[PDB]
Amino acid sequence: GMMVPHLTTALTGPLLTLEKRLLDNMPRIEHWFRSQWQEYGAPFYASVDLRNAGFKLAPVDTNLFPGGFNNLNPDFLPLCIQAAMVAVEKICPDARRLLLIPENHTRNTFYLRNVHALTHILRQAGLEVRIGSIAPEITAPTFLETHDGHSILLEPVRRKANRLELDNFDSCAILLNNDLSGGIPDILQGLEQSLIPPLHAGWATRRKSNHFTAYDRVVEEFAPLIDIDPWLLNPYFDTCGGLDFHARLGEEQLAEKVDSLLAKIRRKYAEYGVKQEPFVIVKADAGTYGMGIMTVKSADDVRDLNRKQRNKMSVVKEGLKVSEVILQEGVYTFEHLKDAVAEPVIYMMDHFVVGGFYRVHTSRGADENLNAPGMHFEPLTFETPCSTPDCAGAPDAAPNRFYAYGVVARLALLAATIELQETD
Amino acid sequence: GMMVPHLTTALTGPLLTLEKRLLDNMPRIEHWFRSQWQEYGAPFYASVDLRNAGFKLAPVDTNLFPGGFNNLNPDFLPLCIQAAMVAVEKICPDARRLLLIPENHTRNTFYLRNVHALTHILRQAGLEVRIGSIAPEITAPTFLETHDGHSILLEPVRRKANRLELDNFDSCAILLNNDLSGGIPDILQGLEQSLIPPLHAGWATRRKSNHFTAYDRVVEEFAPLIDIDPWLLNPYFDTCGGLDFHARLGEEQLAEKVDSLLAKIRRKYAEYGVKQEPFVIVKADAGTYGMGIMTVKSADDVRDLNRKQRNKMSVVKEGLKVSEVILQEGVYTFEHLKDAVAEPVIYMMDHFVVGGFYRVHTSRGADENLNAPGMHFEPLTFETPCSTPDCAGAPDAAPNRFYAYGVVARLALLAATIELQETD
Ligand SMILES: [Cl-]
Ligand SMILES: [Cl-]
Ligand SMILES: [Cl-]
Ligand SMILES: [Cl-]
Numbered sequence: 001g002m003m004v005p006h007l008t009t010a011l012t013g014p015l016l017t018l019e020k021r022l023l024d025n026m027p028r029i030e031h032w033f034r035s036q037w038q039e040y041g042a043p044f045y046a047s048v049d050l051r052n053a054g055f056k057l058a059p060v061d062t063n064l065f066p067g068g069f070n071n072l073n074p075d076f077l078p079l080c081i082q083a084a085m086v087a088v089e090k091i092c093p094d095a096r097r098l099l100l101i102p103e104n105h106t107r108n109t110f111y112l113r114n115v116h117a118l119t120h121i122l123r124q125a126g127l128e129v130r131i132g133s134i135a136p137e138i139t140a141p142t143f144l145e146t147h148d149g150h151s152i153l154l155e156p157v158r159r160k161a162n163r164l165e166l167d168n169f170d171s172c173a174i175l176l177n178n179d180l181s182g183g184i185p186d187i188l189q190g191l192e193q194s195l196i197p198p199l200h201a202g203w204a205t206r207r208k209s210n211h212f213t214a215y216d217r218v219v220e221e222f223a224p225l226i227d228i229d230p231w232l233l234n235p236y237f238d239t240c241g242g243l244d245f246h247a248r249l250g251e252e253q254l255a256e257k258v259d260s261l262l263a264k265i266r267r268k269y270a271e272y273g274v275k276q277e278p279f280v281i282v283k284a285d286a287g288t289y290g291m292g293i294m295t296v297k298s299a300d301d302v303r304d305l306n307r308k309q310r311n312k313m314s315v316v317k318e319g320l321k322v323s324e325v326i327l328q329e330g331v332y333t334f335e336h337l338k339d340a341v342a343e344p345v346i347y348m349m350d351h352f353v354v355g356g357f358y359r360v361h362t363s364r365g366a367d368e369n370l371n372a373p374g375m376h377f378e379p380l381t382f383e384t385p386c387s388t389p390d391c392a393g394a395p396d397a398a399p400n401r402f403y404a405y406g407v408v409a410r411l412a413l414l415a416a417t418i419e420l421q422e423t424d
Numbered sequence: 425g426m427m428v429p430h431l432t433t434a435l436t437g438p439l440l441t442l443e444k445r446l447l448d449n450m451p452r453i454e455h456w457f458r459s460q461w462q463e464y465g466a467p468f469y470a471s472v473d474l475r476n477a478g479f480k481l482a483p484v485d486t487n488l489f490p491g492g493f494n495n496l497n498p499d500f501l502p503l504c505i506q507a508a509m510v511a512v513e514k515i516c517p518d519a520r521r522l523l524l525i526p527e528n529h530t531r532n533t534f535y536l537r538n539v540h541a542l543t544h545i546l547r548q549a550g551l552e553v554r555i556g557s558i559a560p561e562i563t564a565p566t567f568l569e570t571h572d573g574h575s576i577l578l579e580p581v582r583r584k585a586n587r588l589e590l591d592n593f594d595s596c597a598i599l600l601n602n603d604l605s606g607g608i609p610d611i612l613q614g615l616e617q618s619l620i621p622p623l624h625a626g627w628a629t630r631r632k633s634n635h636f637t638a639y640d641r642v643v644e645e646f647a648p649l650i651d652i653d654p655w656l657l658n659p660y661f662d663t664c665g666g667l668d669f670h671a672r673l674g675e676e677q678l679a680e681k682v683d684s685l686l687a688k689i690r691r692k693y694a695e696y697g698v699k700q701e702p703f704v705i706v707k708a709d710a711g712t713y714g715m716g717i718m719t720v721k722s723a724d725d726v727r728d729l730n731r732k733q734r735n736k737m738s739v740v741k742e743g744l745k746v747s748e749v750i751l752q753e754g755v756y757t758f759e760h761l762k763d764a765v766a767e768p769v770i771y772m773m774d775h776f777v778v779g780g781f782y783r784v785h786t787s788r789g790a791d792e793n794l795n796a797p798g799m800h801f802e803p804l805t806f807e808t809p810c811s812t813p814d815c816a817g818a819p820d821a822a823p824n825r826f827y828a829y830g831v832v833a834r835l836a837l838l839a840a841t842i843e844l845q846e847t848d
Contacts, residue, residue: 026550027520027547027550027551027552028520029550030509030549030550030551031519031520031550033550034512034513034517034518034550035518037513038517075499076502077809077812078500078503078809078811078812079502079503079506081811081812082503082506082507082776082811083506085454085776086510088458089458089461093458093462094458094459095455096451096452096455123451124811124812124813125454126450126451126453126454126455126457126458127451127454128451352506352509385501385502387502387505387506387548388501388502388505388548389548
């Protein structure tokens with residue numbers, strides 16, 4: 001009776017091939033993941049955005065600071081609690097107390113609901129948890145309403161002798177729910193307490209293309225394990241160095257790389273009988289200053305950019321802050337909830353899939369199967385577990401689709417784990 | 425709408441005191457358990473039978489070979505699967521294949537359903553699992569119907585060069601779902617593969633009173649942690665040596681110990697305003713030959729036993745096989761499902777509570793609140809999780825009652841873990 005998203009494409013052969021390979025190799029796959037986690041560990045928590053194109057199933061974002069805990073299905077709270085307990089035992093085994101640092105947002109009601117939901121899980125895992133703000137406008141204990149009969153209490157972090165403290169509260173470890181993409185503040189540097197994840201100065205200006213290389217390496221091992229075309233799991237990408245988007249010196253360089261990537265995508269689209277237009281996501285990385293993103297369908301789309309596009313791709317008015325441009329094969333999503341495009345987000349704690357939700361696009365044009373939704377979505381909670389495949393059933397039965405989602409999400413998790421280890 | 429058991433007693437003060445202590449110490453308790461598991465580990469799986477008397481909440485049986493997996497709530501399968509994966513990672517991390525040895529029962533339909541349910545969990549955890557019989561009447565692959573549209577395949581174990589094998593199947597480890605209480609067969613001794621749990625020759629004739637001593641030691645530490653009378657969690661007990669139940673030489677010895685135990689129980693019943701009659705469970709342990717059990721309400725009940733009682737307490741017709749007699753304070757259960765007495769069974773994998781079920785007595789007399797049900801019960805699956813306390817709620821709200829059940833079950837698990845380590 002509960003309506004769920006369905007694919008609006010009949011071209012699903014590659015997805016079903018992937019599902020068949022996973023369901024014919026299920027114990028081999030799970031044994032392989034266990035070998036990987038013995039070598040690498042896993043983060044405390046994470047979320048991975050996927051897109052199901054019917055001809056491809058690929059991760060498109062990995063977040064080590066997930067902010068949608070309030071969107072999880074409450075029937076799965078016990079599974080989350082148990083996984084959070086495992087994470088505590090691996091990452092901070094002796095912890096009694098945990099300081100949670102949120103994003104600096106105090107006016108997003110949904111973000112505050114996430115904080116409440118996350119805090120609840122961590123308390124049920126047996127930790128004493130308090131919320132320590134690093135927002136400069138929080139100067140005293142501040143109660144913020146979630147507009148649902150509850151509130152959260154934000155307290156300003158105080159640094160004393162290489163430790164962060166709150167009123168009568170000295171934690172063992174510090175959990176970041178703030179991605180620090182603007183740079184690790186000096187107040188969080190050189191502390192005695194461990195940060196989770198353990199970020200160090202340099203984090204925010206790291207070479208972000210290493211994320212895509214790390215996922216390539218994971219897929220290069222996994223794809224032959226199950227005998228699948230690695231392209232079914234992995235978008236192509238390329239990079240170039242920093243460019244000045246207020247000049248045209250870098251124009252031909254960029255255009256040539258767009259053309260070459262589009263050509264690679266076209267070869268695969270021909271192989272698999274795909275009729276949609278190839279597209280490329282152009283990501284201008286300006287480190288602490290942010291990132292500018294645009295999508296293109298031809299090399300001409302990066303030539304002679306207009307004023308607004310130049311400003312977007314430069315990221316800020318300060319000159320030449322872009323240090324790398326990443327070009328990635330765009331992946332379609334053909335999942336729809338009635339007229340709305342939907343795309344899934346898979347949640348993990350330690351190396352276990354705990355659930356997730358769909359982002360159901362609020363916009364409604366012909367190109368919502370291409371456009372990234374950003375903040376323009378409403379969540380729709382998952383109805384099916386990801387850890388209960390039916391190996392003899394239909395390959396695209398719901399539990400088998402969700403098993404496949406959980407496999408690709410765990411590949412992306414492993415890649416992020418490897419990447420983070422290699423920043424030291 | 426789903427009917428559940430309710431207490432038929434208004435004398436619940438001690439239960440509510442326990443619940444209040446647990447809910448005022450929840451993070452301290454969970455931190456304490458984590459410290460314990462770091463030192464001791466936990467078994468692969470276990471079940472613990474509890475009785476809620478309103479004036480006491482105590483474990484009355486610990487089983488390291490649980491046989492009621494088919495009675496678990498299917499909505500909690502993902503939680504079981506995840507816990508089973510943790511158990512695999514701690515106890516047999518590199519295992520690809522697992523040989524499961526069942527009880528020698530081939531005609532109990534419910535036991536075969538347990539085997540199917542257990543096998544399903546282990547396969548979902550990513551193991552290749554086969555069922556290896558050590559029953560002498562299984563001499564070829566044998567399909568047994570569960571009378572529910574399914575069957576299980578039993579294959580005779582073959583020993584070759586210090587390993588157990590089946591057709592094209594050599595496992596890494598061996599999971600016992602057979603308690604080997606009749607003695608570890610020679611075919612299972614001196615193997616290269618690990619047994620789970622890791623039993624050694626001598627197991628079946630161990631000193632069974634060490635189980636009660638180990639639980640005493642756990643409660644002696646836990647009770648002061650939360651400031652509770654340890655008697656609220658722990659039945660009194662005593663022991664004597666082997667006795668000849670076909671003679672009366674041991675009669676006065678036994679009678680005196682019954683009298684002394686009853687007197688201790690009476691003191692506590694007076695303290696707490698309990699009006700029910702104290703009772704004692706007399707357990708005659710004959711090692712591999714089995715155990716004889718009777719309940720008594722006075723020292724006179726062990727004097728001048730009749731023929732049937734003498735035979736029961738001697739256990740077998742072979743002479744003087746009883747090596748120890750354990751006397752335990754009997755604990756009432758006042759939970760009822762309408763007219764039927766009910767008592768809970770809590771399931772764990774690794775150190776995590778995964779669910780459980782009530783044993784709903786099929787018999788209907790005035791003394792079913794005292795009598796152990798044995799096989800005379802129908803299962804009723806738990807509706808409430810054990811890991812989701814509401815610390816500010818009513819102490820006997822359902823999630824808080826079940827949190828308390830999961831705490832006492834984990835104390836009994838820890839005790840069994842310590843006991844088993846100390847057999848080596
Ligand atoms: Cl720690
Ligand atoms: Cl930084
Ligand atoms: Cl192993
Ligand atoms: Cl033995």
